[model samples]
Target: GGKLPVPWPTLVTTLVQCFSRYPDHMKRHDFFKSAMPEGYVQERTISFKDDGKYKTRAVVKFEGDTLVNRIELKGTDFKEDGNILGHKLEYNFNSDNVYITADKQKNGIKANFTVRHNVEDGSVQLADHYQQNTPIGDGPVLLPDNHYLSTQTVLSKDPNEKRDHMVLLEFVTAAGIGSASQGEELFTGVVPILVELDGDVNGHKFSVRGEGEGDATIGKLTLKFIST
Candidate 1:
């Protein structure tokens, strides 16, 4: 079996959903919540520069340590140069266990994982606890919900070796996962998008520039966090 071809709508939806929900989920923890007070709504805008210009405006609302609601508005023509194409997606979450699944099976190689926010450290973590076949077991395993799988491949005897970056794996699907609008399905299952973030995280702010294999047409992803 080979990888699947993901559409543009599905890709955008996944990106927006993950980017918005994961950060909001992190705010429930003590590490990030301390800086962000109660009744504060965090806003994030993701601009897409591909075949067409698009932008997603996401607003996350939290009440005391729980994520209550998330509203996202997407503009097709982000530049607003004469035409208007708008989309809206809203999520009223009752639980904090929101996550996205990436599963792929190709050439006897299987990789399955879930992407979610970690409350303990306030960092997005990938876990492969639900795998059955485990074809890539010999490779760098995520070990359930443990530490990040470091991208650096330096064999070290010491257990406390410093890592350079973390790899966020995403598998594209053929049929898609969820629908962004009428007849638009979310997709993910081919060659995984191996995103590596290079930046620093602090109480005041967090920013990172992401580069990966599947982002050639999508371009480079720049994420910056601002605290108000």
Candidate 2:
């Protein structure tokens, strides 16, 4: 006889609630599953709370096992009374950087950062993804925060019979736009409650907290922590 299959989130939820301690193989698959084609091309836009005031813009593109290109910046501005300032910062799109670290034992698998921009003003990749998470947004249409952005994950390394999953994201943030340009690090440790996510709210798209240009602020930043 065959055993019944478990619900996707349900089974995974149990493992998470119990502080998942699965074997290497199980962990491998639980962190590397993708439904999109290998070299598919799609676009995604993440906006922050602008109320039509200031506009936050972002464009994401993936190429077969790789997120090769991306364009991001802000649009217009936010008026105090809830209106689009109509001010556009179309030239603030910092270069998108990618880094790779191999889990030697788990060779076939790789991780990446997509939904989130954690390091220096979009500089190097820093921070950890194995910690608790928080939300980051200004208003509706804004993106969420504290998510995993793993780009290249391989699940073939699992030694388990049921290698089903494709990714795992762990994060912790304050209630505001993440700190990337501030002289101080981890600037987003305490963002505002207004912070919001864009697409997948399962706690992924970390959003910006407030508006207006400041010492170390860049319109509305979108920091996503995605995996799989």
Candidate 3:
């Protein structure tokens, strides 16, 4: 008593049908490619026991003895093992419980499994949850339908920070002056790129015009608060 009594090919064909109605987002469209000489995808019609037949709107186009019978249905696609040593086959029971079976032989070991399909919604159920024959679980688990907004905060500064952009910082008090020489140097005020300032004694809005090279100056100083 292996997985089932149906033909293996029929089971694969039935599985292909199961994904025919699946949406594009749900189905993995590119699973049917052969290793060496890649196969093309096309439409096909497959039939099983009792003349049960349907149109496989989509199938990976490939050939030779490999488990590469690519079939697409619903939003998912499936690829079965190829017929290498030729020890097994899949079969479709063509009944209402919506079931299929597959039997295979590999390295002198043979195994099988039955898949039950839901007739109402077209979903599938496997007889064994795992290859070691773990029993099926309680039931289908549903996903939550609620969502919320989330905000995140940062507490550290960037390591590779640089001050390439220029800004105007006015000193309401002494900033670059602790000795008379530094005060005199600050008072002499280097002429920048022809800038103009307008405001009160220690606070002024300044604007720079025209670009200059190096630290050279050829313009007059309109210093209202020349860092003095």
- Per-residue C-alpha lDDT of model 2 across residues 175-205, encoded as one tens digit per residue: 2112111112212132211111132222222
Model 1 residue runs over 4 Å out of place are 1-31, 35-40, 78-228
The whole-model lDDT of each prediction reads 0.22, 0.21, 0.21
lDDT of 1 by residue, 1-228 (tens): 111111112222222111121122222211111212221222323233221222222232233322222333233323222111121211110112222222234211112333232222342322222212122212221111111111111111223423222223332211111222110111111112222111111111222222323221121222211111
Residue-level lDDT of model 3, residues 1-228, one tens digit each, is 122212222323222111111122322211111111232233333322222232333222113322123333221112222121121332222222211121112111111223332222343333221111011122221111121111111112224434211222111110110211111121122322222211121121122121211111111212111211
Q: Top model by lDDT, which number?
A: 1
Model 2 ranges with Cα > 4 A deviation: 1-47, 50-67, 70-228
List TM-score per model, in order: 0.22, 0.18, 0.16
The TM-score of predicted model 3 comes to 0.16
Q: Which ranking of candidates, highest TM-score first?
A: 1, 2, 3
